Design a protein around this ligand. Structure first.
Ligand SMILES: CC1=C(/C=C/C(C)=C/C=C/C(C)=C/C=C/C=C(C)/C=C/C=C(C)/C=C/C2=C(C)C(=O)CCC2(C)C)C(C)(C)CCC1
Ligand SMILES: N[C@@H](Cc1c[nH]c[nH+]1)C(=O)O
Ligand SMILES: NC(=O)C[C@H](N)C(=O)O
Ligand SMILES: [Cl-]
Length: 307
């Protein structure tokens, strides 16, 4: 096995590839239609799902960009938002591209509040989506909530123009005494249990020691992130305050004393807490010493894909 060939383990696992399909269709749209479609999706989703407030540190890091937009005339505000959607080369688009996903999300959270209050130029009253945009919004509105929030996040992350990296401060790991231990039907493997428990505790320095030097982590619909430096950076920038709720799994040998393990269960993002449970598979390829050579996290097509 290489990292790229390990991508093929448990080929029965049906991922929610409607998510990248929908992002590809979204990406073709006119910029004003991209912004209007997300505005409509976010207004309707907000009737049943409450988004958690951005953290104080995130809002401070986005404050100067938000102040610049708030000082613009309405036409310039709309143009700045279109620049982000179009991935135009501007100072604002370069600042935005330097940000972690959580800072980008907090930026748009605040613009949404200001658009609702009427202090930043809103989507025009009575705005009608293009033929392609109406169909993209219909697809999004038919998806499970876990898939909807993944489409919105991926759309937000893809905006701006791509280098210096700006992320939220790393919060200290949970005190040992207060930590929870997961149980997984079928799976007693210490590496897998330690994975789940250390991520639930934000203990990234313990987590990274589970990997081989050349090991990789593959997030949903992304390429593998290879080696301890790049994986630890991903943990610290993007993986704080998750709740992993694994349910059940299966343990099999792989070539050369390797072990392949598949776990299914749910994950909560701190943006939605218990209000959105994403259906997830973990696919592990462990070397003979129990180190992680490869771990993939898949967003599942439906609850029918849970073991
Ligand atoms: C744009 C825009 C607007 C505002 C949009 C806003 C405000 C959207 C907000 C969206 C949000 C807040 C979405 C959040 C989604 C979060 C997700 C989907 C998280 C998933 C995490 C997972 C699945 C992690 C799994 C992992 C596991 C389990 C591991 O074991 C290892 C690590 C890792 C792989 C990370 C307005 C309206 C103004 C209109 C104009 C344009
Ligand atoms: N700078 C960290 C890197 C690390 C190694 N192992 C876990 N974390 C320490 O030392
Ligand atoms: N292993 C099983 O058949 C359980 C099934 N995946 C559900 O329930
Ligand atoms: Cl998150």
């Amino acid at each position: 096995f290489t990292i790229d060939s390990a991508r093929g383990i448990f080929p029965n696992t049906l991922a929610a590839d409607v998510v990248p399909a929908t992002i590809a269709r979204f990406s073709q749209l006119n910029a004003e239609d991209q912004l209007a479609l997300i505005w409509f999706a976010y207004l309707e989703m907000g009737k049943t799902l409450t988004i958690a407030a951005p953290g104080a540190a995130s809002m401070q890091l986005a404050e100067n960009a938000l102040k610049e937009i708030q000082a613009m005339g309405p036409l310039q505000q709309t143009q700045a938002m279109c620049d982000l959607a179009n991935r135009a080369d501007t100072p604002l688009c370069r600042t935005y591209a330097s940000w972690s996903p959580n800072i980008k999300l907090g930026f748009w959270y605040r613009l949404g509040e200001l658009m609702e209050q009427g202090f930043v130029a809103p989507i025009p009253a009575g705005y009608q989506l293009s033929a392609n945009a109406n169909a993209v919004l219909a697809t999004i509105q038919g998806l499970e909530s876990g898939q909807q929030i993944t489409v919105l996040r991926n759309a937000v992350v893809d905006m701006g123009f791509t280098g210096k990296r700006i992320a939220e401060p790393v919060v200290p790991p949970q005190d040992t005494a207060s930590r929870t231990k997961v149980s997984i039907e079928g799976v007693t493997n210490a590496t897998v249990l330690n994975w789940m428990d250390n991520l639930n505790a934000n203990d990234f320095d313990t987590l990274i020691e589970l990997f081989t030097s050349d090991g990789a982590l593959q997030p949903p619909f992304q390429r593998p992130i290879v080696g301890k430096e790049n994986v630890l950076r991903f943990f610290r920038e993007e993986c704080q305050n998750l709740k992993l709720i694994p349910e059940r799994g299966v343990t099999e040998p792989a070539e050369d004393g390797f072990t392949q393990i598949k776990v299914t269960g749910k994950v909560q993002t701190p943006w939605f807490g218990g209000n959105v449970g994403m259906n997830i598979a973990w696919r592990f390829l462990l070397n003979p010493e129990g180190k992680i050579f490869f771990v993939a996290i898949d967003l599942l097509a439906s609850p029918k894909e849970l073991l």
